[PDB]
């Protein structure tokens, strides 16, 4: 019960079209596998702390990331602070997630498959 900060109106993370939810991860692996070097998507994970995370294809290989929230502030592996997941996402969409894992050097380039309603 964080005493002192309060919240207005938080950002719709399920606004926007790399928005995946709490998918299911076996088929993380398959829809993202398929997709091109460049597909990025933000997924949930039933936990209090880390209720956030992030899929990308990169490297014929499908990684996934961990989302740290604390002290009203959202980041991962604790590398660098973001005024929430937004920012996160704005942050690697245009820098390479290399500085976090040198091993992974891409950019948020397409969203995830997308709902496709109809």
Sequence with gaps: GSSGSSGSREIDYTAYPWFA???????????????????????????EAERFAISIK?????????VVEKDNWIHITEAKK??????????????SLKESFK????????????PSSG
Excluded: W
Aim: aromatic content about 12%; hydrophobic content about 25%.
């Design 21 to 47: 939810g709490n998918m299911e991860r076996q088929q993380t692996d398959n829809l993202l596998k398929s997709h091109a070097s460049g597909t990025y998507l933000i997924r949930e994970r039933p936990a």
């Design 58 to 66: 990169f490297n014929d290989e499908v990684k996934h990331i961990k």
């Design 82 to 95: 973001f005024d929430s997941l937004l920012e996160l996402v704005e942050y690697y969409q245009c820098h």
């Design 103 to 114: 091993q992974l050097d891409t950019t948020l380039k397409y969203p995830y498959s997308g």
